């Protein structure tokens, strides 16, 4: 359980993300695909992309990044009261896309990397700790849902 102050650190950096969600989404998905290339193979619309430049030029990848961060943002703004938001997301990621918990770990690492890079004004150690806690809670609750749904994450 996060404290109110931890949530405030999370939502303060998120507010900066929201200044340019598309840009942040591109940076995060690209960081994930560079750092863990195997994760790209899960995306049929753009698994063929070969380079970061191609990735930056991809309107579809940009749209996907927006879709991811907007969904995540809505979850974060619930401050742990996110059961309703998690149901469809867990179902799709378990059953349609087959995304292991390990890969949700990888994207969380990518989120933290980009925020650290872009937002040192809002992402010092305490803020990064709070964001890590929020993302650990997300993964914990999604992992419990995966189990309910029948998916070894
Ligand atoms: C913060 C973590 C994540 C969030 C909030 C998120 C959110 C979403 C959302 C909202 C969609 C569209 C609706 C849906 O299908 O549920 C989506 C689609 C998808 N997500 Fe994620 N996602 C996350 C992580 C991942 C990761 C790590 C992968 C793969 C390594 C992944 C793979 C997919 C795929 C393959 C689709 C379908 C893309 C397509 O249209 O072809 N997601 N995701
Ligand atoms: O009051 N912040 O943990
Ligand atoms: O885009 N990775 O540093
Ligand atoms: O495409 N925004 O959720
Ligand atoms: O707590 N949401 O599964
Ligand atoms: O449950 N959505 O593919
Ligand atoms: O993408 N994590 O460093
Ligand atoms: O990031 N220094 O607290």
From Swiss-Prot:
For the protein in the UniProt heading, the enzyme class is oxidoreductase
Q: Which domain of life is it from?
A: Eukaryota
Q: What does this protein do?
A: Monomeric heme protein which primary function is to store oxygen and facilitate its diffusion within muscle tissues. Reversibly binds oxygen through a pentacoordinated heme iron and enables its timely and efficient release as needed during periods of heightened demand. Depending on the oxidative conditions of tissues and cells, and in addition to its ability to bind oxygen, it also has a nitrite reductase activity whereby it regulates the production of bioactive nitric oxide.
- All residue ranges annotated as the Globin domain in the record: 1-147
Q: Which organism is it from?
A: Physeter macrocephalus
The UniProt entry's sequence similarity note says: Belongs to the globin family.
Positions contributing to O2 binding: 64
Tell me a GO biological process for this protein: removal of superoxide radicals
Which molecular-function annotations from GO does this UniProt entry contain? Answer: heme binding; metal ion binding; nitrite reductase activity; oxygen binding; oxygen carrier activity; peroxidase activity
Q: Which PANTHER family match?
A: MYOGLOBIN (PTHR47132:SF1)
Name it: Myoglobin
Transmembrane residue ranges: none
The encoding gene: MB
Where on this chain does heme b bind? 93
Keyword RNA-binding included in the entry's annotation: no
């Amino acid at each position: 359980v996060l404290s109110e102050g931890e949530w405030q650190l999370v939502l303060h950096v998120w507010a900066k993300v929201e200044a340019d969600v598309a840009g942040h989404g591109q940076d995060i998905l690209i960081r994930l695909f560079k750092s863990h290339p195997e994760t790209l193979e899960k995306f049929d619309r753009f698994k063929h992309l070969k380079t970061e430049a191609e990735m930056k030029a991809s309107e579809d990848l940009k749209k996907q990044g927006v879709t991811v961060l907007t969904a995540l943002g809505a979850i974060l703004k619930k401050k742990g009261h996110h059961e309703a938001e998690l149901k469809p997301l867990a179902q799709s990621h378990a059953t349609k896309h087959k995304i292991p918990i390990k890969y949700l770990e990888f994207i969380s690492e990518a989120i933290i990397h980009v925020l650290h890079s872009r937002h040192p004004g809002n992402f010092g150690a305490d803020a990064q700790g709070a964001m890590n806690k929020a993302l650990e809670l997300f993964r914990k609750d999604i992992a419990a849902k995966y189990k309910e749904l029948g998916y070894q994450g």
